[PDB]
Amino acid sequence: QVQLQESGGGLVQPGGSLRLSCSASGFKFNDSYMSWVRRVPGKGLEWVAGIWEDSSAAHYRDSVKGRFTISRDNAKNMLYLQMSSLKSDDTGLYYCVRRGYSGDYRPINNPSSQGTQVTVSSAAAYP
Amino acid sequence: QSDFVGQTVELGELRLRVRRVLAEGGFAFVYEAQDVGSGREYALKRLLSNEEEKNRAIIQEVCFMKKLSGHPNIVQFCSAASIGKEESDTGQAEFLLLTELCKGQLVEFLKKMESRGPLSCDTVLKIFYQTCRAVQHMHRQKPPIIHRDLKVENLLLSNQGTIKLCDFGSATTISHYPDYSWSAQRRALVEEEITRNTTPMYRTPEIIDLYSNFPIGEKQDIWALGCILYLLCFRQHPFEDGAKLRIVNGKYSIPPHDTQYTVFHSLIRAMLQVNPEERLSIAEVVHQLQEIAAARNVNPKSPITELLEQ
Numbered sequence: 001q002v003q004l005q006e007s008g009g010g011l012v013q014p015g016g017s018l019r020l021s022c023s024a025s026g027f028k029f030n031d032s033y034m035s036w037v038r039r040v041p042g043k044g045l046e047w048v049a050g051i052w053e054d055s056s057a058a059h060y061r062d063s064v065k066g067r068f069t070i071s072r073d074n075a076k077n078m079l080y081l082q083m084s085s086l087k088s089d090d091t092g093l094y095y096c097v098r099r100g101y102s103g104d105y106r107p108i109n110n111p112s113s114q115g116t117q118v119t120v121s122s123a124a125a126y127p
Numbered sequence: 128q129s130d131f132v133g134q135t136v137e138l139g140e141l142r143l144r145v146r147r148v149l150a151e152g153g154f155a156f157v158y159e160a161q162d163v164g165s166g167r168e169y170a171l172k173r174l175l176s177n178e179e180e181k182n183r184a185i186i187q188e189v190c191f192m193k194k195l196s197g198h199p200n201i202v203q204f205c206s207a208a209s210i211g212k213e214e215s216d217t218g219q220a221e222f223l224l225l226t227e228l229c230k231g232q233l234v235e236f237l238k239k240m241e242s243r244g245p246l247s248c249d250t251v252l253k254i255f256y257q258t259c260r261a262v263q264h265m266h267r268q269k270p271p272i273i274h275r276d277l278k279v280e281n282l283l284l285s286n287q288g289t290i291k292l293c294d295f296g297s298a299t300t301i302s303h304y305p306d307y308s309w310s311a312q313r314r315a316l317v318e319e320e321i322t323r324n325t326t327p328m329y330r331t332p333e334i335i336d337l338y339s340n341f342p343i344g345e346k347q348d349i350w351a352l353g354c355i356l357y358l359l360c361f362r363q364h365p366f367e368d369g370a371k372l373r374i375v376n377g378k379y380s381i382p383p384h385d386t387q388y389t390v391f392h393s394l395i396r397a398m399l400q401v402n403p404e405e406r407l408s409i410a411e412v413v414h415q416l417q418e419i420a421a422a423r424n425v426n427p428k429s430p431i432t433e434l435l436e437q
């Protein structure tokens with residue numbers, strides 16, 4: 001069966017940067033359109049970025065345009081998200097899923113994986 | 128048809144990659160299409176025919192969809208195209224419909240739930256309320272649009288997990304009011320067009336008996352909705368054997384020893400009235416479902432998450 005594992009999330013200052021990582025197994029990755037999605041408390045799921053199976057196209061939600069960069073390594077079955085110039089609106093649980101979105105940035109597939117927590121705060125340590 | 132996968136369809140400013148087949152229903156195919164520039168996913172319905180009667184029926188259906196779009200329970204219309212007989216590869220006139228992408232068919236979701244047992248009352252209320260809410264939007268049009276083919280098979284589950292009406296192939300704005308001025312010729316030609324556009328077990332008393340002076344209008348959808356609510360509650364369709372004598376005489380029975388869907392019993396009886404004029408209006412049905420939902424503290428517009436997560 002399908003397996004997705006995220007990493008790279010953490011507590012970073014506004015204006016900061018992070019690199020998220022996603023490992024896929026259980027399906028033909030080289031042929032799947034892959035997406036980065038986030039769960040935000042009091043909001044729900046929102047689609048963030050997506051990339052074509054061969055990387056010939058990368059798509060982004062307007063709020064992350066010019067700040068985020070989605071990439072993939074079909075050889076190592078890895079998916080990445082370079083986040084920069086981070087905002088508090090970027091705080092959430094980030095997951096990586098197959099396929100794109102429908103209508104108002106709503107993912108086709110709901111995440112089954114653990115996800116990785118991105119917290120855009122100045123706090124010394126986690127609360 | 129199957130070979131149309133891997134294609135890059137242009138519909139306005141959109142450039143849809145045809146990804147995979149979702150459904151096949153005669154002369155039409157349903158595919159999962161994805162915009163190459165945005166990543167937004169859609170449903171693409173393809174129809175190949177050179178028959179003028181079909182071309183005219185596609186125009187009507189698409190015109191109803193354009194008008195009904197925007198209701199939370201009507202499938203959202205995005206764009207459509209009609210490529211000519213010469214202008215297509217197949218040599219047939221090509222009809223393309225682009226809508227919002229739904230999770231799947233309601234029928235395939237209920238088939239997975241039967242293993243888990245009978246549906247909860249709250250699940251039934253949401254499925255039913257959202258369906259009636261779609262029909263209400265239709266009957267509210269000027270002129271009213273009568274579906275004529277309401278059944279669980281024509282119901283999809285949206286991305287959010289809400290009911291979506293997708294097919295309007297049998298819908299009409301034409302009501303009939305049979306009289307003591309109608310010929311056998313008229314009666315049979317009327318009976319002919321309605322048999323083609325209905326599911327036999329979902330056929331109404333007013334279309335089985337064209338010698339009752341029962342009007343043939345929006346009340347047809349109420350009878351079909353009475354059948355749906357019976358089907359969701361109990362295992363089977365109230366007239367699954369498709370017997371004309373049972374349908375025309377209203378001979379069905381609510382399971383004598385049920386204590387789970389009692390809340391809906393009154394409504395089933397009120398909707399499955401033999402005379403259409405003695406049947407509830409869609410507004411009365413919606414109002415009664417709203418009260419049931421209120422006395423239970425359920426928002427009936429809510430996602431049917433009981434189906435979705437499996």
Ligand SMILES: O=C1Nc2ccccc2/C1=C1/Nc2ccccc2/C1=N\OCC[C@@H](O)CO
Pocket residue numbers: 149150152157170172202224226227228229230231232280281282283293294
């Ligand atoms: O959006 C969709 N996601 C799906 C997943 C599985 C099967 C079908 C569909 C589907 C459909 N989206 C649309 C939009 C307009 C018309 C038909 C239609 C669809 N499927 O139709 C299949 C059942 C239908 O033939 C019942 O009348």
